[PDB]
């Protein structure tokens, strides 16, 4: 039966590495944590190793491992993410921040031995020097959002579309429109997602005992519709 279903049987260790440049501002993120696909649970802590992070943490959330998503039995046949393992998959995205700049990301997610690794490249351009993102106007929070997993037969993978609302201090809201492509790293078999989706629920926090610019992240993700 199933592809790499057995790999996410228990608690998996996660390693995250991001290298990005936004409007010329270089920076690097490293994160360690663990995931429990059984419960769609993820616990991570990210550290900005290049000093102080230039953008807002919240804006990195989506970029910073859907294979940890909990799939209810009746819909396991659409688990594209777990089926690409251990080989992995490449996840690409364009994230447009309404009336602002956008992010371009390239990532590869795969197992390095028993560690699930997310290696990522990020590039930010057209950011208004005095807007929400660059002029840190975003609140340190997150909205339980949904992701519209839509197959893309041709790329042998999938395509996804969704948007994210970021709460602006003023009580308003900054929009982030995601466009994501996903192609399998191996040449192997993968499951093709019927038009489904993911109910997600994040929770960012701080570690008082942490002197470095960082973000604590707790999150549950489940597949529905």
From Swiss-Prot:
Effect of residue 65 to N: In R10-3; matures to the red-emitting state with excitation and emission maxima at 555 and 585 nm, respectively
Resulting phenotype, residue 30 to R: In mut1.28; shifts fluorescence lifetime from 3.03 to 2.76 ns. In mut2.2; shifts fluorescence lifetime from 3.03 to 1.94 ns. In mut3.3; shifts fluorescence lifetime from 3.03 to 1.88 ns
Effect of residue 146 to K: Increases fluorescence at warmer temperatures such as 37 degrees Celsius. In Esmerald; leads to brighter fluorescence. In VisGreen; leads to brighter fluorescence
General function of this protein: Energy-transfer acceptor. Its role is to transduce the blue chemiluminescence of the protein aequorin into green fluorescent light by energy transfer. Fluoresces in vivo upon receiving energy from the Ca(2+)-activated photoprotein aequorin.
Protein name, UniProt field: Green fluorescent protein
Domain of life (superkingdom): Eukaryota
Tissue: Photocytes.
Nuclease recorded as keyword: no
Effect of residue 203 to V: In EBFP1.2; shifts the excitation and emission spectra to shorter wavelengths and increases quantum yields compared to BFP
Reported biotechnological use: Green fluorescent protein has been engineered to produce a vast number of variously colored mutants, fusion proteins, and biosensors. Further generation of mutants led to more stable proteins (at 37 degrees Celsius for example) with brighter fluorescence and longer fluorescence lifetimes.
Effect of residue 125 to V: In EBFP2.0; shifts the excitation and emission spectra to shorter wavelengths and increases quantum yields compared to BFP
Consequence of substituting residue 172 to G: In GFPA; leads to enhanced fluorescence at 37 degrees Celsius. In Venus; leads to yellow fluorescence, improved maturation and reduced environmental sensitivity
Family the entry assigns: Belongs to the GFP family.
First and last residue of the signal peptide: none
Keywords of this entry: Chromophore, Luminescence, Photoprotein
Gene Ontology BP term (one): bioluminescence
Name of one Pfam family that matches: GFP
Effect annotated for changing residue 199 to F: In H9; increases fluorescence at 395 nm excitation
């Amino acid at each position: 039966m199933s592809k790499g279903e057995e790999l996410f049987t228990g608690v998996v260790p996660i390693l995250v590495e991001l290298d990005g440049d936004v409007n010329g501002h270089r920076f690097s993120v490293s994160g360690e944590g663990e995931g429990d696909a059984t419960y769609g649970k993820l616990t991570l802590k990210f550290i900005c190793t290049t000093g102080k992070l230039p953008v807002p943490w919240p804006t990195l959330v989506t970029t910073l491992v859907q294979c940890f998503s909990r799939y209810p039995d009746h819909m396991k046949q659409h688990d594209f993410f777990k089926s690409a393992m251990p080989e992995g998959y490449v996840q690409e995205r364009t994230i447009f921040f309404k009336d602002d700049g956008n992010y371009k990301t390239r990532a590869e997610v795969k197992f390095e031995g028993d560690t699930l690794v997310n290696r990522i490249e990020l590039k930010g351009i057209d950011f208004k020097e005095d807007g929400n993102i660059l002029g840190h106007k975003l609140e340190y929070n997150y909205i339980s959002h949904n992701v519209y997993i839509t197959a893309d037969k041709q790329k042998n993978g999938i395509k996804a579309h969704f948007k994210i609302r970021h709460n602006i201090e003023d009580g308003s809201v900054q929009l982030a429109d995601h466009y994501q492509q996903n192609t399998p790293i191996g040449d192997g078999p993968v499951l093709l997602p019927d038009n489904h989706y993911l109910s997600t629920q994040s929770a960012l926090s701080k570690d008082p005992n942490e002197k470095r610019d960082h973000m604590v992240l707790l999150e549950f993700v489940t597949a529905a519709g």
